[PDB]
Each structure stands twice: as structure tokens, then as C-alpha cells.
Amino acid sequence: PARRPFIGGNFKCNGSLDFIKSHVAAIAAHKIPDSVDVVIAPSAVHLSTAIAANTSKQLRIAAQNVYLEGNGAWTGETSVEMLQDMGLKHVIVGHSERRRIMGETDEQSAKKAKRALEKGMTVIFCVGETLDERKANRTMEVNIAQLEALGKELGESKMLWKEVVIAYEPVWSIGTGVVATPEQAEEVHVGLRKWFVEKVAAEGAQHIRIIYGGSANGSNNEKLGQCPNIDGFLVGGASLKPEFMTMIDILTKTR
Template structure:
């Protein structure tokens, strides 16, 4: 049985004080649930959030990392740096990283390998643009993204990866793929994994949906057969909203 994972992606929001207040407001409320609760925050907040969440089931993740261990990469952060402060997860290949910062399938693959090597849980993102969707290219596009992201990743490591399917046209727009459409694409992604690793491994991999998920629609989304969680942007910024998401 795959454990659902609800991850908040705060993007470029919150000061340290605001982030700590958020963790203090939610950490006791998520205890005892059957859901993995995760907050992915800006780098500056991570040490304080890890400390605030210590001893609770709330996990703290980063929004990006570099694939090299060290070097002349101004502005970048390594896996070892994240591990050093107690981070457990890292988002890789978010569409905003691809769109604004030159992320490619190749760098996603390198980062996924590095995260697994170091013991971090990578959340690998995939998803199509509106133009690709209207052209009927959703599945073919996601297939290439997943196949290239998982290149060289061993079958034993594949279940350690979380996949987030995020149709780009639904991120921050208020538009959401219908729960049935989202489940259809996620079921297809699982079939891609079957082709790479076989049925048993495919059934172990958790696949989230992301794209304007909010308290009003999370229950419907999570009731679908192949959706194992949600990667949530704006609706994860308020403690009350995040708790409603976790307690779908």
C-alpha cells in the first residue's frame, strides 16, 4: 500500500519567522495521520524549519539542488549541504525551474541520481504545457520526461523516487485538470514505469498530482485510484489550508 504524500511547495514565500510559526501551528495536528506531510521551503528557512519540526512527523524538503558535490557554482546548494541541516526531500525539475532557469531532462536525471546516492528523496516533476495538451501530446511528452529522468536509475532505487505530475497550464492559474484526467495521465505514467521496471516496482512508486490543488478539491483528487498525493503551491501557505489538505 502506497502511503499518500502531501507536499507544500512554498516557492519564494515566507520569512524564517513566518515559516516557523507555520510549522508550530501544524506539527501537532498532523500526528497520527496516515499521510506523509512535507513542506518544501526556500533555502533560508530550512534550518529553522527542521528545528521547529524536530520530533514530529512533519518532513522538510528543499525546492532544488545541484548535481555536483561542490565547486564553483555560485548560488547553488549541494545534496550534502541539505543533508547537513536535516532536509529529507528535494523537488527536482519543477516546471518553473525548467521554464525560468534552464532545467532539462538531463539535469533532472543527474540531480535524481545524486539525491538517491546521498539518501535524499527526490520529487521528480513532469507535465505538459497547454499547447502540448491541446495538440494531444500530453502522454508522449510525459513519457519522454519520465524515461529520461529515470535513465540509469536501478530498479531497487526507483521506488525511492516520488513523481509529481503537474500540468503546467494548471499551476497557479486556478485551473485544475479534472480528477479523472489527472488519474488517467498518472496511470499512464505508471505504465511507463512498468515498461522500465516491471509491475512490482511500478506499483511501489508514489505519483502525486499538482496544479491548483486546494482544500475544496483535494478529496476528489485523492479518491482516484492512481493518485498518491499532491504537490501544492498557494494552498499550502496557510496552516488551516495545509491541515485540510493533509486530512483529506
């Protein structure tokens, strides 16, 4: 019932060509053990520059988003086919910025994930509740609904769930500095784990990785990483900084 630690860095809409070259080189120069998964997600226009700068045998490059159709008449959108042609294994789907600011629906996120998973990618599937939703006592209702939408698309497929990494990021913690307490985070992760047991049964559930995000940084990650159901982190702001490497180290010696 053991799971490989995972840390992802979401650069979001940040970076210049020079920054991508210099920052990817810095991360690639860091010692990354073979025991943990480390990925970084540059902006789409920077993926090929990042791949060229990535001299690490461990670090992987991920995309921040992908569309729910194959190649075709989808102006402004990227297909799974394009990502795989570039050699990428990982993609972030359902980030709360896309759900809450850009109108990506629960079904849209689920259909994106399904298509990527079917084609063999690993999907970092994001869920999370807003401050108001938590205030209304709907935290689990909201997170479960987002997962249920995925479940509707994936059913109980062994193949499909294998390469899902759930990222729980309370929306009130994203970019705000208001990191969840270890108790708040673990509480939600236990709820999600229980949901997985019901949907794919106990064995299937034991291997689903759940990472935390929302103001995770070099200074606060250790205590969170000690929680049994927190398998690692999705890191936004700190992923643009040297402290990202500190987080890699900490996740390693903790888990």
C-alpha cells in the same frame, strides 16, 4: 500493491523569518498520523529556521531544489551533501517553474535526481505538459520524455526508484486555479503507471508513488484523492495557508 499516501507543500519563493516560524509551528501543531508522509519545502535560506520551528515527530522539511555536483565551485548552488548535513531526507527536483522559466533541461533534472537518490534521499520528481503541448495532443509524449530522461540516468535500478515520488503537475494548472478534473489527472497517472511497468516491470511499478499537483486545495482535493493512481498531492499556494492542514486530514481519511 499498496502505497503510503504523500502530501508535500511547496512554499516556493515566499516567506519571511517570522512567517516560517509561525506557519511551521501551526502545521507542526496539527495531528499528523504515522500512516501518511507530510513534507514542506521552504525556501533555501529558511530551511534551518523551519527545522528549528518543527516540533512535529511526523512533519519533514524538504528542499525545493538541489544541484547536480557535490561540494565545490558552484556559486549559488546547494549540494546533496549540504542537505543531508542539515538532516533533510527530501528534495523537489524538476519543478516546472525551473524547467520552463529557468531553463532546467530534462537531463539536468534527471542528473539532479540520480545524485540525490544515490546518496539516499527521497526525490519528488516533477513532470508536466503545457497548455499548448496538450492542445497539440502531446501530453503523454512530453511527460514520458521527462521520465525517460530520468530512466536513462537510473536505468532499472531497484535501489534508485524506491525513493522516487513522481509529481504530475499540468503546467496549465500551476498557480492558475485551473485544476485538472479527476478524469484528466487519473488518465495521465494511468499512462505513467503503464510506463513504469515497461521500464521496471510490474513489481517495481506497484510501489512507485504518483502525486498530483496544480491548484490542489482544501476544497477540491477529495475527489482527486479518491482516484486509485493519485497517491496524494504536491501543493503550492494552499501550502502557505491553514487549509494545508485540512488537506492532510482529507488525504488521511480518504486513503
